[PDB]
């Protein structure tokens, strides 16, 4: 059923599973029209489809042309998401197809279930975790590839870089969710933390800086401080 704190280690077992986050599929800027009315302008979006065990992020970039001439775009966005996830599963070899797909928002359940009727053995599940995957567009290289796209395109990222050489997938996921929660709560501060020191670089083929184990502990502590700080600043505590 629903994925929560009670069954959190299930994410890192050997049953293939994918998280699907649709929070950046339909993105707009709201602005005033010459007549003083309000209108939206869409910008490129993305589906965030992640294997939490391996770190594989199947980033389908959603080009603004997919919305041209369409109505009820927030509803269409959920069905477009489900169509693209179903197309991804069908493109994978059988032994690579997930056994479960966990959606981060419950409104994706029915669209994905209907698109996956051909796959009765793949379980479509909600989660009670509040995962910070919306912040994926705060990762510079992911944001860059989405905004530059001129056509629909699938970008193939490992969101853990090489961390699994040194840590388990439970620890890697915890690090990712901490980084993304921080970027979501105060993006400027979070990015200052990650890049303050010019001697720690991001490899061309990575998303995050090449921190030593000791520097990651420092970094991780700074992100928790930031999150607690903002939680004070926010609630005044």
């Amino acid at each position: 059923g629903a994925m929560n704190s009670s069954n959190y280690a299930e994410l890192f077992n050997n049953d293939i599973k994918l998280f699907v986050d649709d929070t950046n599929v339909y993105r707009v800027t709201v602005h005033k029209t010459f007549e003083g009315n309000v209108a939206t302008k869409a910008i490129n979006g993305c589906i965030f489809t992640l294997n939490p065990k391996t770190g594989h992020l199947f980033l389908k970039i959603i080009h603004t042309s997919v919305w041209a001439g369409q109505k009820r775009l927030s509803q269409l966005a959920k069905w477009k998401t489900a169509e693209e996830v179903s197309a991804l599963v069908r493109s994978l070899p059988k032994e690579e197809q997930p056994k479960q797909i966990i959606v981060t928002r419950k409104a994706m359940l029915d669209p994905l279930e209907v698109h996956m009727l051909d796959f009765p053995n793949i379980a479509i599940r909600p989660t009670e975790l509040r995962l910070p995957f919306s912040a994926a567009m705060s990762i510079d290289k992911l944001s860059d590839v989405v905004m530059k796209a001129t056509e629909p395109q699938m970008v193939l990222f490992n969101i853990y870089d090489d961390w699994l050489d040194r840590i388990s997938s439970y620890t890697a996921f915890s690090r990712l969710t901490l980084l993304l929660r921080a970027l979501k709560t105060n993006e400027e501060s979070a990015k200052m933390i990650l890049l303050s020191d010019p001697t720690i670089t991001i490899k061309s083929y990575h998303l995050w800086p090449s921190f030593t184990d000791e520097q990651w502990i420092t970094i991780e502590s700074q992100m928790r401080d930031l999150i607690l700080t903002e939680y004070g600043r926010k609630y005044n505590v």
């Binding site: 269409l76 029915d110 669209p111 209907v114 009727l117």
Partner: protein, 300 residues
Amino acid sequence: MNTVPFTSAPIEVTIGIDQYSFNVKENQPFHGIKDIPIGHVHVIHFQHADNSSMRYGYWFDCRMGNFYIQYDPKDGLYKMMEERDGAKFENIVHNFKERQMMVSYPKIDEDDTWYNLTEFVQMDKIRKIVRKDENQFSYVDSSMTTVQENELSDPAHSLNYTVINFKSREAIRPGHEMEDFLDKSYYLNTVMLQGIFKNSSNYFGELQFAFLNAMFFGNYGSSLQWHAMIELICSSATVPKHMLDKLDEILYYQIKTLPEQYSDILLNERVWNICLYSSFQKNSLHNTEKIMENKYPELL
């Protein structure tokens, strides 16, 4: 005007005939029901005084044979039977009528309720939902499950209603996922009406039969079927205008007849609020919406 003779009434029982109900005492000199209107199906149903568990009953049409009721002390219920000897039967009925041992179907002349609840219900279709081909009448009770219920356990004793499932390949054309899920017209008009039912009369007949089994026996799977068939029409943007007008009349008389004190169990809040206030046909059911709002404003 036809007659159903009772051999006797050995156990205290409430007997209902369509929307009417009456009490018979243990060993009371009761020998059946006369003046039953020809031209309609009917249902004669039972609730024992000592065990309100299991309402049960029989759907029948007096044009199809001579039927009578006899209590079976081994199986513990009133059973319908067919009398093949026509002169024996006429003679039994005549004697019981002469002794005024039969109650009279109390049809008020102004009253079209039963017609309006069974307009599209035919015995032959009942007998395909309820499979027991050696009899011309059909037994139903409170506990019988539907084919769809058994998919989610004795098949011989099932209600074989037409399976409706909105998240099924039958309901959803490959490549029309969003279209077909948000607008069920394809599934209503092509799959069910053209494909399975053949016409709207057969669809309405199953809808009406399902409601009546829900109301008279508390049959939960029948209630599910009734709501599913309503929801499939209301969730279709494209429905023949004659079907919508007839549906409004059908539901009006079902809501009018429903006991007020059974609304909590026999009406699904989600389906009715969706159908009357959110669906494509939210504006097409004036008579049903008006009686629902005056009679069950709480549900809404």
